[PDB]
Amino acid sequence: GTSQWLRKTVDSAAVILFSKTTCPYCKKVKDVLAEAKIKHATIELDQLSNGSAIQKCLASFSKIETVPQMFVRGKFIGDSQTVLKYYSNDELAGIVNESKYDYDLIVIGGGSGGLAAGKEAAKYGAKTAVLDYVEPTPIGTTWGLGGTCVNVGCIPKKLMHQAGLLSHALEDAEHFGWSLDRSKISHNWSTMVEGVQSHIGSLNWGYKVALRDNQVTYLNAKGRLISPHEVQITDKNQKVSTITGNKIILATGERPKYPEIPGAVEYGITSDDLFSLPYFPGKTLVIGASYVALECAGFLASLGGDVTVMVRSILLRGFDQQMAEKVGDYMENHGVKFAKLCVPDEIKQLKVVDTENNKPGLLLVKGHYTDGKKFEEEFETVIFAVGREPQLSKVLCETVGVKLDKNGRVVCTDDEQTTVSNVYAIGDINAGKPQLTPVAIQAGRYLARRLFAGATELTDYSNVATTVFTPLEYGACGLSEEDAIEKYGDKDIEVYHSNFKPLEWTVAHREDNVCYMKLVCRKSDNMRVLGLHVLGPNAGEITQGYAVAIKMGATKADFDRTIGIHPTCSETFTTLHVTKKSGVSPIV
Amino acid sequence: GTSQWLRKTVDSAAVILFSKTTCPYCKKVKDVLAEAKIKHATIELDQLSNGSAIQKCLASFSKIETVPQMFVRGKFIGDSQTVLKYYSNDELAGIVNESKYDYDLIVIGGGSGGLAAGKEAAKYGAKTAVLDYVEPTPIGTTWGLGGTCVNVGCIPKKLMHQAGLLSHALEDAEHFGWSLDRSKISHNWSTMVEGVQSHIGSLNWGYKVALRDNQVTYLNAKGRLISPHEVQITDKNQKVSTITGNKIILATGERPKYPEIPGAVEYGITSDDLFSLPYFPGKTLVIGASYVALECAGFLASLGGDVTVMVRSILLRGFDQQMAEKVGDYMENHGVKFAKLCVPDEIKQLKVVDTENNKPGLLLVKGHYTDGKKFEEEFETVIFAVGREPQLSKVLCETVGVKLDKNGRVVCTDDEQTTVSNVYAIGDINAGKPQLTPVAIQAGRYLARRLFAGATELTDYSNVATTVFTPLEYGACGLSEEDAIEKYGDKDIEVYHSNFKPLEWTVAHREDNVCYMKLVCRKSDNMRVLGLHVLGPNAGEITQGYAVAIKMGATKADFDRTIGIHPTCSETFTTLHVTKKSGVSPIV
Ligand SMILES: Cc1cc2nc3c(=O)[nH]c(=O)nc-3n(C[C@H](O)[C@H](O)[C@H](O)COP(=O)(O)OP(=O)(O)OC[C@H]3O[C@@H](n4cnc5c(N)ncnc54)[C@H](O)[C@@H]3O)c2cc1C
Ligand SMILES: Cc1cc2nc3c(=O)[nH]c(=O)nc-3n(C[C@H](O)[C@H](O)[C@H](O)COP(=O)(O)OP(=O)(O)OC[C@H]3O[C@@H](n4cnc5c(N)ncnc54)[C@H](O)[C@@H]3O)c2cc1C
Ligand SMILES: CCNC(=O)c1ccc(NS(C)(=O)=O)cc1
Ligand SMILES: CCNC(=O)c1ccc(NS(C)(=O)=O)cc1
Ligand SMILES: CCNC(=O)c1ccc(NS(C)(=O)=O)cc1
Structure with a gap:
């Protein structure tokens, strides 16, 4: 039990020191590693209930039972006199950098989970690389480091939600005694987009700064796992090459789906495009009924848009249905129109998007209700919010042996381990887990601590709270x-x-x-x-x-x-x- | 003992039925009491883990061990056959209304605690009177039923806090893309006060409607306890009389203090006056440093005022001082001035309040710092917020024997009982308890349940959360x-x-x-x-x-x-x- 914990911890930690807080020999080793800028994990045996047993078990690796004991990548390096010898002889740097692989850890995907995992691992001396690439949308939209939430998810959505809330604040202010007239005030879409994108840009930059200051290597390159320890990278110039790592963390997330109807990819958009759109969408149709669909329809109406939501069956499938109906009734009472029990059959183009004058195009949408009656109406913008899916065929060669479920997500044990023992998955692609940014951050931080610092704490995925940022x-x-x-x-x-x-x-x-x-x-x-x-x-x-x-x-x-x-x-x-x-x- | 809980419940309840949910005889008794419009408490024995022992102990009062058993004011009335005999003989209404006192409960004080206690008692058939009278302020301010929070406390304070918050919402709205110019917008104090006072009036009317619909007698009259069961009342035409009650609940609250210095009562005001003031205060000095002082200074500054706070020693004494200092720093950075380590000496009148043109007067304030230097500056309004105190001299005669502490607050057991066995105290006048509206409501409802429905649950006064509604x-x-x-x-x-x-x-x-x-x-x-x-x-x-x-x-x-x-x-x-x-x- 203790012995099985000790072997897993020694085998996979990059650099780790076994120590006691009262021991001045351990303190002298701590000072030498700090001076040489060698990062490492530390386990203080005197602060654990079974430190005595752990001390005994260490002898199965080092043949000594005293502290300090220092290890690099599963190998006992020495006690105090031995470490000091290597330092004094200019030998310690080369010992701590010796490895079978290029990296102790390769993270594929630079978003909520992957950035969290990579920064945490580097804290304990693991030599880390984080790969991130953003495949452009069909109209060419792309963005910087940080993943879906930072660039095209929670952050810009809640900022636009707040712009919508402030419209009711302007109305409320008259009743509380302020002299303004809400009826003479309008909203400027592109002014709002500029401010949102300026904050997103500060986040892109802040993450690159943080990886630099943690000595993490950042590659703006598309990764592909081709064997358990080999990652093939393709850079912006199409140069292909291979890197190796001991541990692999898959953290590549998902992208929006499109329905298979004529005109959808060519003339509609998704949330990926909405948060940086140069022009106001205009009269808008939102197809779908997820929280993404309702949040976007909601703030567009509060900013003055003429908005319709086309609902296949119900709102917020998987959420409490009494609450979902109250949510939808409020939006319908405050300006949002609903086309219920209805699906789209095709999108036809009536005008091309005007890049010059910065204006939307014009579309004709044809569909039908579940009883067979016809839907036909014109819209300037059509947003598809009909779900999100991973694309692991682009990330994962079938011969590696990583098992997937029937939706294409990764089947993991309760410690995020895939069917390949050195390979893990976190975030939205981990099958059966809640698909949320704080979950992905907690999973990646906790996993890095188990791999590289001897932690045991698991991520608890039960009873995780949610909020849908609809107008109410x-x-x-x-x-x-x-x-x-x-x-x-x-x-x-x-x-x-x-x-x-x-x-x-x-x-x-x-x-x-x-x-x-x-x-x-x-x-x-x-x-x-x-x-x-x-x-x-x-x-x-x-x-x-x-x-x-x-x-x-x-x-x-x-x-x-x-x-x-x-x-x-x-x-x-x-x-x-x-x-x-x-x-x-x-x-x- | 189960037996001594049963004895206290039977003695104190006004009307109580011991019943079982499965018994059709208890069912017919309930229907009869419902048709006769007789309210009562019910104890369903089949839902208590020792209903067996309770059945046995009921024999001590009624010499029977079956169910149903009806009691009125400590007297056993009968089983199913006997209650029906009284009903069909038109003797039941007289039997349930027979009592030694005019009322089962008299509440002195119609605020947060007292209204909650009175409404709760009446649901169990306790015949209840609620007394409320508002002694006017020195300038003659008065208000309606509901107490300090409803009329001159939490409700108007947070509504004016919200008016202040809307100012920052106007400034924020430009950055989020709305076309308004915050610099050309101003605030109208009297318009805000009208909207605030209209909401307070709806609460005044709501509580009068609540009492009438629960068959509670409401007397707008000053009450005085002169013996354990006798309450002397004085109406609006100075008419004095006496009413009697079995249980008494003191719930008369507190009022603001003035410092003993010249000009204070004559020319200053307090929070009692601020929330219905017919003119904008103008350039204002707030004397004191409690949550009332900072909360009022904060919204006054956000509505455009020139505001100073005179602090004797520290901010928010009794709160975490690191947090208090952060609270005041934010206020000082956002327009509130502070005159620190300073007390006032006198208030001199320079200009009388202009009732007709709806304008404040003008005052000269004189004071000095703890090192000896002098303070001298003019203000249009001076607001005192230097504490609150009860005036139980006005409420309770010395000879009754209700013990007070050195501050003038009632000394109570952990079930709100005074030194006089039928008299209880709740709310701000209960010594040592947190002085908050939800505390007073919970104490009142829980006490009523113990007196008239056989409940045992006590109010927990520990770790009660708080919020100070300063600008941040x-x-x-x-x-x-x-x-x-x-x-x-x-x-x-x-x-x-x-x-x-x-x-x-x-x-x-x-x-x-x-x-x-x-x-x-x-x-x-x-x-x-x-x-x-x-x-x-x-x-x-x-x-x-x-x-x-x-x-x-x-x-x-x-x-x-x-x-x-x-x-x-x-x-x-x-x-x-x-x-x-x-x-x-x-x-x-
Ligand atoms: C519109 C919207 C609103 C949302 N709002 C909220 C909200 O309010 N609260 C909340 O908790 N969650 C919200 N979410 C969910 C949240 O965005 C996700 O749960 C979270 O971002 C998932 O993080 P991740 O690390 O699993 O993947 P991601 O954040 O998607 O990051 C994966 C990254 O890997 C990159 N990548 C993919 N393939 C490769 C490859 N082969 N090589 C290299 N890099 C690759 C991707 O381009 C991406 O940058 C929202 C999502 C959307 C779409
Ligand atoms: C400015 C201010 C802001 C506040 N803000 C908050 C807040 O945000 N949150 C919070 O929890 N608390 C707040 N409080 C405190 C809260 O208002 C009190 O804790 C609460 O009102 C106490 O209620 P009570 O029933 O004890 O007394 P009260 O509500 O004061 O009611 C007592 C009533 O009895 C009347 N009375 C007195 N003597 C007699 C008599 N002899 N005969 C008949 N009637 C009599 C009084 O006139 C009054 O109507 C605030 C207080 C102030 C002053
Ligand atoms: C000419 C493009 N055609 C398509 O059918 C398409 C491609 C990629 C998509 N999504 S992505 C960016 O790979 O995440 C969606 C649709
Ligand atoms: C700084 C990162 N370390 C940790 O989070 C951690 C590691 C081991 C622990 N306990 S044990 C009994 O040695 O397994 C506790 C916490
Ligand atoms: C709705 C009013 N009743 C109560 O609050 C209550 C009274 C007694 C209880 N339990 S007992 C019989 O004393 O054992 C439970 C609840």
């Missing part, structure tokens, strides 16, 4: 109500709910009974909170803190005994009492 | 850093901390390193989280949810294993790692 935001943590009932049965499930009105909405004359929250609980387990849901402003700030409590096993009793902060929206969770079974109305 | 808001739960070090020793305390920047502040070009958060933890108790602190936008929404986790005993490992929601301010709590002992900088 939807936060959630845990099970939907229909999932809870399916798993435990209706008689074992109690639901507490209530409407509420933000105090900020009162003087602004906004709606009385639109915001909503519920707790889904299990009767036979001390009224354990199985799921939490809230529709209202700042839903991400509201929901985050409760995710710690649900992680700890919170029950309805724990919510009741905690006192609220007044006046907040979030405090309504501490006094819930109306049950759905009672039939009593949840209005205020 | 400050939320907290648990111990300050200095208090934890004093209690446990510096070597046993670890503090994790970080600056952060809201995503919304990036395009708006706001400050990089002013928002700040920290966790104060106990090493020898598994890194238990002893206190959480956050300075940033929406701080009360951020803080509330973690209050549940802290109530459950969260440790640092609990915060680490929970995943963040991105992009939010609150997610920074899930990845903290820089300790103060390490000396590493916390900037981003």
Whole structure:
């Protein structure tokens, strides 16, 4: 147990020191490695409950049982007198750089997970390379280092969401006494895009600076794993070459899908293109009903667009469906049109995009409803948000032996190991995991610590909270109500709910009974909170803190005994009492 | 003993039915009481883990061990056959209304705690009177039913805080692409006050409607306890009379103090006057340094005012002083002036308030610094916020025997009982308890349930979360850093901390390193989280949810294993790692 942990740790750490905080011999080795700028992991045996056993086990490798003991890539290098000898003789640098491979770690993909993993590994002396390449979209859009969230995901989406929220702020200000007239103010799309892109550019630069200052090699090159330890790279000039690494982390993410209909690739766009578009989209059709589809339709309408969403079946498939319908009803009440039970059959081009005058084109969209009636209408911009998929055939030779599932994602053990023992996968391509930036960051940091610093902590993928940044935001943590009932049965499930009105909405004359929250609980387990849901402003700030409590096993009793902060929206969770079974109305 | 809980429940309840959910005889009794419009408490014995022993103990009062059994004010009334006999003989209404006192409960004070206690008691058939009277301020300001928070506290303060926040929203909107020019926009104080006062009026009317719909007698009259069961009332026409009650709840709150200096009462105002003031305060001096003082100074400056704060010693005494200093620095950088280490000596009138043209007067303030130097400057409005105190002399006669402390607050047991067995106190006048509106509401509802429905749950006053709504808001739960070090020793305390920047502040070009958060933890108790602190936008929404986790005993490992929601301010709590002992900088 201890011995099996010690062997895995010694075998895969690049540079690691076994030590005690009280030992001045260990301190003298620490000072020598620091002076020579040699980074390494450290395990302080006196701060572990079974340091005694570990000290004994080290002898199976070094034939000594004292501290310090220093190792490089699975090899015992020496005790204090031996390390000092190598240093004094100008031999230590060459010893710590000796390796069978070019790199201790190669990360394929420079996004949320891959950047996190690579920087963390380098902290412990692992010689690291991070590869990143951005295949341009069909119209040629491309961007810098940092992945989907930084460049064409969470960051620009929430900034445009905030531009949309500020329109209601301008309306609210009149009621709170400010002299402006909202009716005489307009929005300039390209001014907003310039500011968003300027912040994204600071992020691109900041990541390149951070890899430099951690001695990580950054290659702006497309990678392909051709054997367990060999990565083929293709640079911007089409020069092909091969590098080797001990450990491989696959972190290449996904890209948007297009439906297989005439005109889609040629004349529509995706979210990849939207966040840097030089012109305002104009009258827009959004095809799809994911959170990407609704968030984009939402802020486009708040910025003055004429917007329609075409929905194949339901909104937010996989989310609690009562909450999804409340989300959609609010958008429909504040300007978004919906073409329900409808799919597209073709896109026809009526005008080409005007690069000169900076204006969209014009399109004719033909489709049909599930009963066979026809859809036909003209739009200036058509955005497809119909899912995302990995392209691992471009990343992964079939002969390496890395197993994939029926969706093309990588099958991994609970420590992110693929079917090939030195190869791991993290982020959106890890099958069955929540596809979110903080998950990918936590998985990559934790994995790097296990590979190169002897850590054991695993990433916990259960009960991970989410927020959908629609015009009225939807936060959630845990099970939907229909999932809870399916798993435990209706008689074992109690639901507490209530409407509420933000105090900020009162003087602004906004709606009385639109915001909503519920707790889904299990009767036979001390009224354990199985799921939490809230529709209202700042839903991400509201929901985050409760995710710690649900992680700890919170029950309805724990919510009741905690006192609220007044006046907040979030405090309504501490006094819930109306049950759905009672039939009593949840209005205020 | 089960027996002594049953004895206290039977003695104190107004009308209580002991029942079982499966028994059709209990069913017919419930329907009869419903048709007769007789409200009552119900104890369903088949849902309690010792309903067996309770059935046996009921024999001590009724000489029967079956169910249903009805009691009224400590007297057994009968089983199913007997209750029906009374109903069909038109004797039931007289039997349930027979009592030694006019009321089962008299509440003195119609605020946060008192209204909540009174409405809750009435649901269990307690015949209830609620007394409220608002003694006018020195300039004659008065208001309606609902207490300090509703009329001159949390509600108007946070609505004017929101008016101030909207000013920065106007400036932000230009950077996000909206065509307005913030420089040409001004604020109208009286328009804001009208909207705020219209919302307060709807709450005044709502509480009167609530009391009427719960059959609660509302007397707009000053009440005085003269013996354990006798309350002397004085109405608006000076008419004096007496009413009697079984239980009494004191819930009369506090009012602001004035310093004992010339001119203060005559020419200054307090928060009581500020929220309905008919003219803009103009150039304003706020005297004091509590949360009331800083919150009022902050929104006044955001609405265009010229504002100074005179500080005797420190800001926010009793709060974490590192956080208090960050709060004040932000305020000083954004337009609030501070006259530090300074007290006032006298207020001289230069110009009377102009009621007709709706203009403030003009004042000369004289004071001095703790080293001896002099302060002299003119202001149009001087606001005192130097504490609040009860006036229980006006409420309670010395001879009744209710013990007070050296501050004038009522000394209570952990179930709100005074030194007089039928008299309880709740809210701000309960000595040693946190003085907050949700605390008073929870104490009131829980006390009512114990008196009239046989409940046993107590109010938990520990680790109650707070938020100070200064221009940059400050939320907290648990111990300050200095208090934890004093209690446990510096070597046993670890503090994790970080600056952060809201995503919304990036395009708006706001400050990089002013928002700040920290966790104060106990090493020898598994890194238990002893206190959480956050300075940033929406701080009360951020803080509330973690209050549940802290109530459950969260440790640092609990915060680490929970995943963040991105992009939010609150997610920074899930990845903290820089300790103060390490000396590493916390900037981003
Ligand atoms: C519109 C949108 C909004 C979103 N909003 C949120 C949100 O609010 N919150 C949230 O938590 N998540 C959000 N997400 C999800 C988030 O973007 C992803 O979960 C996250 O970025 C996944 O990170 P990753 O490291 O797995 O992959 P990515 O971030 O996609 O990074 C993979 C990188 O590898 C590169 N690459 C691919 N193939 C190769 C190759 N052969 N060689 C070299 N490099 C290669 C890619 O070009 C890319 O740069 C959003 C996603 C989208 C599309
Ligand atoms: C400016 C300000 C801002 C605040 N902001 C917040 C905030 O954001 N959050 C928060 O949680 N708390 C806040 N508070 C505190 C909160 O208002 C109080 O904790 C709360 O009102 C206490 O309620 P209570 O029931 O104890 O007394 P009150 O609400 O003060 O009610 C007592 C009532 O009894 C009446 N009364 C007094 N004597 C008699 C008598 N003899 N006969 C009849 N009636 C009588 C009083 O006039 C009053 O109507 C704030 C307070 C102030 C002053
Ligand atoms: C002329 C291009 N035609 C296509 O059919 C196509 C290519 C790539 C796509 N996506 S990507 C950028 O490889 O992520 C989508 C569609
Ligand atoms: C600095 C990175 N190290 C870690 O995260 C870490 C490593 C080992 C630990 N424990 S053990 C009992 O030796 O396996 C704990 C933490
Ligand atoms: C709705 C009002 N009732 C209560 O709050 C309550 C009372 C007693 C309880 N339990 S007991 C019988 O004392 O064992 C539980 C709950």
